[PDB]
């Protein structure tokens, strides 16, 4: 069909990236397809960061379609900040392409040690215009306007190591990715893909919470006060000065997480947020959760949640859609 498909390759079944191209000469890059941000960036040839020494860099001189800008800009993520300047060149995703304003990152030190430990060169934001720095229209919105795709929407079907690969589909909804039918939840703001849901972590509840659906986040996040209470009665231990929480794999008290809207319910069984630490000793398990204080009631449903539910991001409907993923 006309839908533009982009494969999502799995790495140590903890993260996934996809391929993207910049420039008329088509320089390739491994990118994080991040619904939690709205800017695109690839490490620049002019980047002196040690991290850049092992990454695919972008050479703007090798592209005749390159439009110089120069404006300086920084992008701050929960995991760190990157710096560089704007440029504009041809951007290629799957079989679609288009001139798009992006950032050439020349400084990645504050994204370490993550940046060099994992494998991705840059990040492609899939959020909304107001979530971007530089008022940039989402590329999927761009493509739809330029009639290169049927609908201004995209979907995420995450991979499962040694089972199947995942796919970022742009343009339409492919029924082979999920079971049953898709239910939608209207966004409370066209910034992140954020909706209202009553959060239920066992007996702990936060009604009408603000929930962000983010493919670029590898855990489930909750406000500190709420998550610390949660871990309190569940015998969850925090490794000192480290974003890691563990408990016993045989802990039968870890509840099924519940996210309810007026009409729908989304759950996440413990199997989706617990992992044995050692590959030979299954005594202790890691809890895929992390305290993040954006505000008093904001939660981030990252990959653990998306490995269970196929997701649809519809700009026109200004909604996020959910359904059980196949396999």
């Amino acid at each position: 069909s006309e839908n533009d498909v982009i494969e999502l390759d799995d790495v140590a079944n903890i993260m996934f990236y996809g391929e993207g191209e910049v420039g008329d000469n088509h320089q390739k890059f491994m990118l994080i397809f991040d619904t939690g941000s709205a800017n695109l960036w690839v490490p620049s040839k002019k980047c002196n960061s040690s991290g850049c020494s092992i990454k695919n860099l972008y050479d703007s001189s090798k592209s005749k379609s390159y439009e110089k800008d120069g404006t300086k800009v920084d992008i701050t993520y929960g995991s760190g900040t990157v710096k560089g300047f704007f440029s504009k060149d041809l951007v290629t995703l799957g079989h679609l392409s288009m001139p798009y304003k992006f950032i050439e990152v020349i400084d990645t030190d504050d994204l370490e040690p993550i940046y060099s430990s994992v494998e991705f060169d840059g990040i492609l934001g899939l959020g909304w215009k107001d979530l971007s720095i530089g008022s940039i229209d989402p590329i999927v919105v761009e493509l739809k306007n330029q009639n290169k795709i049927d609908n201004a929407l995209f979907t995420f079907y995450l991979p499962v190591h040694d089972v199947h690969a995942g796919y970022l589909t742009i343009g339409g909804i492919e029924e082979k990715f999920y079971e049953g039918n898709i239910t939608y939840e209207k966004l409370n703001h066209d910034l992140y893909w954020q909706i209202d849901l009553d959060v239920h972590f066992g007996k702990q509840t936060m009604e009408k919470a603000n929930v962000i659906v983010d493919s670029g986040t590898t855990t489930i996040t909750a406000p500190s006060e709420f998550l610390n209470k949660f871990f309190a009665n569940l015998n969850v231990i925090k490794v000192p000065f480290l974003p890691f929480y563990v408990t016993t794999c045989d802990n039968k008290e870890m509840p099924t997480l519940e996210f309810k809207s007026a009409n729908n319910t989304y759950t996440l069984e413990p199997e989706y947020y617990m992992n044995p630490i050692l590959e030979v000793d299954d005594t202790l398990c890691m809890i895929t959760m992390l305290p993040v204080d954006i505000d008093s009631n904001t939660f981030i449903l990252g990959d653990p949640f998306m490995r269970k539910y196929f997701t649809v991001f519809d700009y026109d409907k200004e909604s996020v859609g959910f359904a059980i993923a196949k396999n």
Binding site: A38, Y77, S79, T81, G125, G127, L131, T219, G302
Partner: peptide
């Protein structure tokens, strides 16, 4: 872990 924009 990773948390992608403020």
């Amino acid at each position: 872990x990773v948390v992608x924009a403020x």
